[PDB]
Amino acid sequence: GPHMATGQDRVVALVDMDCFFVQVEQRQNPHLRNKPCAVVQYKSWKGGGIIAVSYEARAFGVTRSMWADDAKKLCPDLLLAQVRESRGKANLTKYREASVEVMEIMSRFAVIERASIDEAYVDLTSAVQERLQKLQGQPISADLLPSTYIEGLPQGQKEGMRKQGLFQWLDSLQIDNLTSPDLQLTVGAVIVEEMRAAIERETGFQCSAGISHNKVLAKLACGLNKPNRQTLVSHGSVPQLFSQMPIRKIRSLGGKLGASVIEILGIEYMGELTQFTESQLQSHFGEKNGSWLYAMCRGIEHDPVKPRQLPKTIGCSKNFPGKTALATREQVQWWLLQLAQELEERLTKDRNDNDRVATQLVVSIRVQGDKRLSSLRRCCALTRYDAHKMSHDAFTVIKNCNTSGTEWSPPLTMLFLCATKFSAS
DNA sequence: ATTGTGACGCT
DNA sequence: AGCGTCAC
Ligand SMILES: Nc1ncnc2c1ncn2[C@H]1C[C@H](O)[C@@H](COP(=O)(O)OP(=O)(O)OP(=O)(O)O)O1
Ligand SMILES: [Ca+2]
Ligand SMILES: [K+]
Secondary structure, three states: OOOOOOOOOOOEEEEEEOOHHHHHHHHHOHHHOOOOEEEEEOOOHHHOEEEEEOHHHHOOOOOOOOEHHHHHHHOOOOEEEEOOEEOOEEOOHHHHHHHHHHHHHHHHHOEEEEEEOOEEEEEOHHHHHHHHHHHOOOOOOHHHOOOEEEOOOOOOOHHHHHHHHHHHHHHHOOOOOOOOHHHHHHHHHHHHHHHHHHHHHHHOOOEEEEEEOOHHHHHHHHOOOOOOOEEEOOHHHHHHHHHOOEHHHOOOOOOHHHHHHHHHHOOOEHHHHHHOOHHHHHHHHOHHHHHHHHHHOOOOOOOOOOOEOOOOOEEEEEEOOHHHOEEEHHHHHHHHHHHHHHHHHHHHHHHHHHOEEEEEEEEEEEEOOOOOOOOEEEEEEOOOOOHHHHHHHHHHHHHHHOOOOOEEEEEEEEEEEEEEEEEEO
């Protein structure tokens, strides 16, 4: 009743750069704009691996993690841009720098949590209060929400329906109540329209966004209307929305845990979780997961938007699949050097830009025929930004994995160097 | 022969 | 600490 908290205390947005690496390449090369096109890493094995796909190309069935030769079968006019190669591996610097452009604009409007290179959560609660007090009672015009969908409306041409739903929502709004969660979300959506307009004006990049009361709903909302649109998911919209939502679509339930929720409880949709007590869910999935599931099938989640615009780790990884697996000492040392040199370059830039120094080096490897994605993960001290020293230390840390009697066996299928544990500098 | 990231939880 | 999960 009156004491049941409804998770309506915050306004949270999730901003997601539409096919980001593709947009970066389309900005640089106008011949790629408004065409079916994709970004690929490497080129020899089956044309290279596709890692990003424009919406025009998605219409032909082109997806990430598909070989370029196969994508060309689906879409023979597909245009491709290749990731830069430096020191023998893919180098994502162009995309990291573009991401910083976007994140810096978002940070003007509100505090952000960098979730990935192309995704950030936005805490809008204080921004909405400020904008509400600046309104002082006037309603919100549809003209302030030109790309917003209201999930679940209209009820009772795609752009025509978008506007019908928005009109239903806005006519229903009680603007006089400065504490109405639905009003707060709507003002959040106005601010996100402005943020998205600023991103596009100042970078050329388009994005989609979700606006709701927490991060999981904001992420779910963001996915409902792409590309270049934003979606408001109100608390009231959750029962219908969840009633036919596959559990795997909710952030963190797309893996083994979600599969076990489905198998153990015999359900398919998020909304079905409401039938179970909190103790029942904790009994199947643990105290933390159980309480989380109990609240989140009701639209409630408390995970904060962390004030963190920079990555916490700086990592350099390369797979050596099939017959490219590393089999000699000279090879392992040469690739550790290559990785360590990219890492030193990025670390020196990070120290200059962000006033911090990493203090721990994580070295990880995969060994041929090992079922796990990482076979070994050991850490050593990171005391100066020197590629030769880091590569020597990584070798020293992994060298007892060699079971030979100048050869390396079993062959190595992945090397990974990661700088972690930053401290202010 | 999805690769190259990056965040967080468990024990 | 090292390993596992999840997503991007
Ligand atoms: N597995 C991956 N390997 C390499 N890069 C990836 C991988 N997954 C995603 N990315 C890269 C390419 C994307 O441009 C960028 C953002 O990822 P993601 O948001 O999932 O898709 P996207 O931005 O390309 O399209 P959209 O969000 O519009 O559906 O990160
Ligand atoms: Ca994206
Ligand atoms: K993303």
